[PDB]
Symmetry: C2
Subunit: 144 residues, 2 copies
Amino acid sequence: PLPPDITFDSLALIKMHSQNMKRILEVTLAKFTVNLSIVTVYRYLTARAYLKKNIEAEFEILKDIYNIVPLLDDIAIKAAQIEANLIKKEITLDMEDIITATTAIYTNSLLVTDDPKRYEPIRRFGLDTMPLDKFIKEVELMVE
Amino acid sequence: PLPPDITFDSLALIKMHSQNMKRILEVTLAKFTVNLSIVTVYRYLTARAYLKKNIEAEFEILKDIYNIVPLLDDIAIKAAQIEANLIKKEITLDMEDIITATTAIYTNSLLVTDDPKRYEPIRRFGLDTMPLDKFIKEVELMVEK
């Protein structure tokens, strides 16, 4: 029941690359198109650079296995419109969340996340989400 | 003294595009290379979106006059290395400020800003900042000649 195009936020991506999720990641990469915002990639890389002196090799691997979507002009434009609208409704969200969410709408990617409630105000603009625990379970259910 | 390459953060850029600053801006664009992070552009456009302006046209206007620097690979990598270094010293910094500063280091732009203090932990990596009021004075004197 999962659509072909998905994405992750930074915390979800960090969990997806943890050693205990190897098998879910392999299946995910074998069966979905994964479109990561450069901003998500940036934040994941800050978590990686906390441990390692070299993160460049890491980035090259991500660029191969994922579609890394830049902060395109259309995304900058659409993010500005969404963020303006939310602020008027007394809701002001972090840059990372707006760009992640707007990039997901732009690529028609389902946003797999540990905290889907944080993006609930953006669903009005076409964003679809799924909890990571539920994504994982659905990947586990892909079993013969 | 201003170097050849300059950049603004979003609130500086907002003030720079005010009517009463038109002459400062024209000389700035004429005598310097201004290099804007896509982050900065995005922040500016959010303010324009809030005022119900034509955002496609406002982005075109900006691209027609500034060199807009994307979130390049090297910027992403360097920014991350910077942020991790800083977080390890218990320095929490905002993504946009990290990208804006890192983009300035990458293009060797002087970062002109209202709030130089918030980028002060990044100066160790090569960033140079200037207060906006001092920038305006430098450009004023060039105008009067």
